[PDB]
Design a protein around this nucleic acid. Structure first.
Ligand SMILES: [Zn+2]
Lengths: 49, 93, 162, 60, 49, 49, 159, 49, 164, 221
RNA sequence: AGCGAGA
């Protein structure tokens, strides 16, 4: 229990390409997914996000 | 598959460790080795007395040999003496 | 008391007692472990005497005891009447299906060969009984999986967990 | 109907040697040859043999 | 060579030439993937359901 | 799976030299979603008859 | 000790731009939370300012260390343990210490080595990381156009 | 058990037929049956359940 | 090959002698094919020296490559130069370092090994999976004479343990 | 304790062991022997070395040697057997080292028991080549040898077609870098990008890819 | 290997 990790704030960017193009060139109609992480050290005390 | 004619082949027996006749169908006129691998799991050798003398290689490694490469005879002799005298003390004191 | 009524084909769990017996009684019995133990058990096994004894038991004895004795007599007579000896049950060599199987099944064969070669090396180098015994058990399991995977224990699984 | 069955299961399906022979007979107009042994029976033989089951076909 | 499979025929609507030479996202190993679209106008006949 | 990987590597993570970005291995998650959308039984090839 | 805009050095983040501070009652105490975004990692560390100095906060270095790294770069007669693994461990610990002198020695020695022969990819990665952190530190030591820091590094290494 | 479950006769029946006294003894029997092959202990049974 | 002379078909247990009689070789390496040149290995699971040539009528190294060399074995690689289809016919064998028991006669209830030796199934399993020792021979008359000697020796040992 | 019923629990646990599973069987089997300490390690070493020297000298003296006296000879053969005894004790003690370290390599390539056995082979080698006079703890050294043995095994008996160790390391290196470049870029790098990163040609990149291919179940079109 | 479908 000396350090902990946490997640928060899921978010989505704009899709990397439009539906028809994704259909054409085989690429999967998908968007990036972002999560804000947060690493805590209990011994000293810090939060890295 | 014509059978009336083809390149003939000779047959030569190769005795194994457990002495198995193995007549090897090699070309009717061709050089052959002294020993030929067989389904016996090892290689049998021609019955007639020839011997190219295979001159087997030394064993790759041994714990004693490998020990000699990091130690010397004197300290091993000293440890031998120590073990001996400890045992003798155990038996007769 | 274990000695005073001792006779072979007799299992002994808790090998501590076995090693005690061996060190104290190195002679007067030979105790084995594994397939080669069964090979030796079959070697010192005369079919005619056992078949006759079982036939006598069935002819004179009655009840549940007779029923088991009859069950065994089926197989025992099967080996007596035919010229096939029970050595065939224990295997010294495993045949290799020709290379058309081509690599689900082939992989099983590879496992067997790996474990056999490692066992050979282990006997050659000189290994503790524990390691070599475990390797022998592994070879047994590999041959098991090869002839019938999943019959005993969890089936050997391949890629995709199948 | 026995001959047609044997024809079907041997030279229409499996027999690797008869098959080219029946094709040749049809092309050239000769009598259809005699069926051989289907190639699946031998793979069965090899597999049983591979299970340490000595399987032999005695002549008589 | 790519040949019309047995029992097919018709007009060539479209041909797409996705090539590594064109720097298309070809799967590793193929240098040029071409897809030909063949269309046929099927009319009603015996056997149709 | 990702948390198992993280938790395993924590015993071998030097203190204070670790940040979430170097700590989180995203590959299992993307692999799981991909192998879901492809070959998962409940991800069926659309039927546009 | 803390001023917004100061790139406080703290490894392996090195210099990190400090934004603001937060007196929050975590654990029932409003002790201050110095927030610092390190652009190298592009992440924010809201470390309690109370223990920020405790963990080893420090500012940028002057010109004494600058000349010192030059003299060290010109320091000859370095020998390593024969086995590759132990020397790799030694120089890895030297980097992990965070001392500018040790990382400079590691980088220059490994460069003369790989210029002689060209050793391996893991040591290439090590050299890349160490040189990156060192050139960033030097560029912000002189505030001298980090690409120009690369060039002055290229010139001074010539010796 | 009689207080909460005594109203029914089956509960009294199983109470007498239980022939098993002691919380330590009950946890011992369960731990013996749940994860056998491991050495029973009076510490890793409450954790088990 | 095969003819209509199939009047009788027989199946039976195959002894180790029969198995090594069938085999045209002895595979002893877990190597299928070279990763680069894509050819079978020597003494591998696809060895051409054992199961025949991959492509008909040439040895591995290629010293002999045509039909007139039918039934000949090349000295360099040992491949018997013949038809390729024989690869569906020739068998190998692995010489196990230690004996193993065939599963079918072990686990198929009723365990035919167990019934033959009158060993209970769980017991037999523990033996052949290395979990419990079994005796295989014992002594008889000299057994009587040293049993008296051994009665004395256990009297000695019992007296010593009682003394402590 | 003198708890006969708890005694019965332990006695069942050890006397009529179910031995259900192979790994469970071996794992419970390896806990029998306790671990040792440095003075035990060095004494045990000196014992095995003395036994080996006795065996060597008696091999020498078996040929044109001397008929050694009964007491001295019996003692020295006792020492010879004691040397192997000591080697066995060390090996059984450190089987737990083998299993702990081989744990970290599970899940890829091959089974678990094979990894344990190859680690046993690495450690038999390690004891073969272990020196106490330098005064270093055994586990240090044996760890490296087991790691080497397990990695070599994984190189050889893992794919249907063995790939050589240097090739294995370079292809694994490629896999690791492409993983890192996915993290740092978000897209699969092109072969040219990997080639420039590795200071090799893209031809070699693609050849590594082709060699990394493994046959799938046989159960283009 | 997995999906869906016709009789
Ligand atoms: Zn050749």
């Amino acid at each position: 229990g000396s350090m902990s990790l946490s997640f928060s704030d899921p978010r989505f960017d704009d899709v990397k390409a439009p539906v028809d193009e994704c259909k054409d060139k085989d690429m999967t109609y998908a968007a990036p997914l972002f999560v804000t992480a947060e690493f805590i050290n209990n011994n000293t005390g810090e939060i890295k996000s | 598959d014509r059978n009336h004619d083809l390149a003939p082949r000779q047959i030569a027996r190769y005795r194994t460790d457990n002495g198995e006749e193995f007549e090897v169908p090699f070309a009717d006129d061709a050089e052959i080795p002294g020993t030929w691998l067989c389904r016996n799991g090892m290689e049998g050798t021609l019955i007639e007395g020839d011997l190219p003398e295979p001159k087997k290689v030394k064993p790759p490694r041994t714990h004693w040999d490998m020990l000699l490469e990091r130690r010397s005879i004197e300290e091993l002799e000293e440890l031998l003496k120590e073990r001996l005298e400890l045992i003798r003390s155990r038996r007769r004191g | 008391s274990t000695f005073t009524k001792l006779a072979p084909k007799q299992l002994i769990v808790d090998e501590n007692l076995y090693r005690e017996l061996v060190d104290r009684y190195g002679e007067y019995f030979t105790g084995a472990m594994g397939a080669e133990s069964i090979q030796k058990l079959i070697e010192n096994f005369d079919i005619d005497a056992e078949a006759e004894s079982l036939r006598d038991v069935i002819r004179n004895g009655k009840g549940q005891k007779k029923l088991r004795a009859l069950k065994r007599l089926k197989v025992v007579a099967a080996f007596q009447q035919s010229g096939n000896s029970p050595m065939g049950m224990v295997l010294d060599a495993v045949p290799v299906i020709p290379p058309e199987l081509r690599s689900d099944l082939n992989d099983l064969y590879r496992r067997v060969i790996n474990r056999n070669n490692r066992l050979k090396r282990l006997i050659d180098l000189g290994a503790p009984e524990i390691i070599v015994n475990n390797e022998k058990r592994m070879l047994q399991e590999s041959v098991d999986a090869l002839f019938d995977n999943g019959r005993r224990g969890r089936p050997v699984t391949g890629p995709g967990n199948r | 109907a026995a001959y047609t069955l044997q024809e079907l299961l041997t030279i229409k399906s499996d027999d690797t040697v008869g098959r080219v022979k029946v094709y040749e007979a049809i092309v050239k107009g000769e009598n259809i040859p005699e069926p051989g042994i289907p190639e699946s029976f031998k793979v069965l033989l090899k597999e049983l043999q591979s299970l340490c089951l000595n399987v032999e076909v005695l002549s008589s | 060579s790519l040949k019309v499979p047995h029992g097919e025929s018709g007009k060539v609507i479209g041909i797409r030439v996705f090539s590594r030479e064109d720097e298309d996202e070809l799967p590793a190993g193929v240098n040029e993937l071409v897809r030909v679209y063949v269309a046929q106008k099927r009319k009603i006949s015996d056997g149709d359901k | 799976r990702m948390e198992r990987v993280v938790r395993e590597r924590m015993t071998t993570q030097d203190v204070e030299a670790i940040t979430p970005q170097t700590l989180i291995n995203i590959r299992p998650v993307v692999a799981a979603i991909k192998e879901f959308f492809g070959t998962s039984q409940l991800s069926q090839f659309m039927d546009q008859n | 000790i803390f001023k917004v805009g100061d790139t406080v050095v703290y490894p392996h983040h090195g210099a990190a731009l400090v934004e603001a501070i937060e007196t929050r009652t975590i654990k029932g105490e409003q002790k201050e939370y110095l927030v610092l975004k390190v652009a190298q990692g592009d992440l924010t560390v809201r470390v309690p300012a109370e223990n920020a100095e405790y963990v080893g906060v420090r500012d940028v270095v002057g010109q004494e260390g600058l000349d010192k790294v030059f003299q060290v770069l010109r320091a000859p007669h370095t020998e390593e343990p024969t086995n590759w693994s132990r020397r790799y461990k030694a120089n890895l610990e030297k980097l992990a210490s965070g001392d500018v002198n040790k990382v400079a020695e590691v980088v220059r020695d490994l460069w003369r080595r790989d210029q002689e022969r060209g050793l391996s990819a893991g040591e290439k990665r090590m050299l890349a990381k160490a040189r990156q952190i060192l050139v960033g530190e030097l560029a912000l030591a002189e505030s001298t156009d980090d690409a120009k820091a690369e060039t002055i590094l290229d010139e001074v290494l010539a010796a | 058990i009689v207080e909460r479950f005594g109203f029914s006769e089956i509960m009294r029946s199983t109470l007498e037929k239980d022939n098993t006294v002691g919380t330590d003894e009950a946890l011992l029997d369960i731990y013996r049956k749940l994860r056998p092959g491991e050495p029973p202990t009076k510490e890793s049974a409450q954790t088990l359940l | 090959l095969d003819v209509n002379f199939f009047d009788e078909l027989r199946i039976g247990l195959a002894t180790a002698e029969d198995i090594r009689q069938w085999s045209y070789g002895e595979v002893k390496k877990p190597e299928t094919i070279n990763y680069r040149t894509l050819k079978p290995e020597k003494d591998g699971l696809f060895c051409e020296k054992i199961f025949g040539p991959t492509r008909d009528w040439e040895c591995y190294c290629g010293k002999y490559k045509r039909v007139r060399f039918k039934g000949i074995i090349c000295e360099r690689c040992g491949v018997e130069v013949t038809r390729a289809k024989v690869r569906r016919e020739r068998m190998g064998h692995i010489e196990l370092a230690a004996p193993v028991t065939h599963i079918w006669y072990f686990k198929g209830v009723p365990s035919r090994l167990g019934y033959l030796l009158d060993l209970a199934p769980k017991d037999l399993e523990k033996i052949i999976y290395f979990a419990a020792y079994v005796i295989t021979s014992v002594d008889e008359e000299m057994r009587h004479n040293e049993l008296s000697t051994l009665e004395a020796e256990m009297a000695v040992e019992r007296k010593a343990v009682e003394d402590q | 304790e003198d708890e006969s019923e708890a005694l019965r629990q332990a006695r069942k646990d050890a006397e009529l062991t179910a031995s259900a599973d192979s790994v469970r069987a071996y794992l419970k089997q390896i806990g029998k022997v306790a671990l040792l300490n440095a003075e035990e390690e060095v004494e045990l070493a000196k014992r095995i070395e003395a036994g080996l020297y006795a065996t060597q000298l008696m091999t020498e003296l078996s040929e044109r040697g001397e008929k050694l006296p009964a007491a001295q000879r019996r003692d020295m053969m006792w020492i010879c057997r004691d040397g192997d005894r000591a080697k066995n004790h060390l090996l059984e003690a450190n089987l737990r080292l083998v299993v702990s370290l081989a744990k970290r390599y599970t899940g890829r390539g091959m089974a678990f028991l094979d990894l344990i056995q190859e680690g046993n082979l690495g450690l038999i080698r390690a004891v073969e080549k272990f020196d106490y006079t330098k005064g270093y703890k055994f586990s240090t050294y044996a760890t490296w040898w087991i790691r080497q043995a397990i990695t070599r095994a994984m190189a050889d008996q893992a794919r249907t077609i063995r790939i050589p160790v240097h090739m294995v390391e370079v292809i694994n290196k490629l896999g690791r870098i492409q993983r890192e470049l996915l993290q740092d870029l978000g897209r699969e790098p092109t072969p040219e990008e990997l080639a420039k990163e590795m200071d090799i040609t893209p031809e070699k990149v693609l050849e590594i890819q082709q060699y990394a291919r493994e046959p799938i179940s046989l159960d283009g079109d």
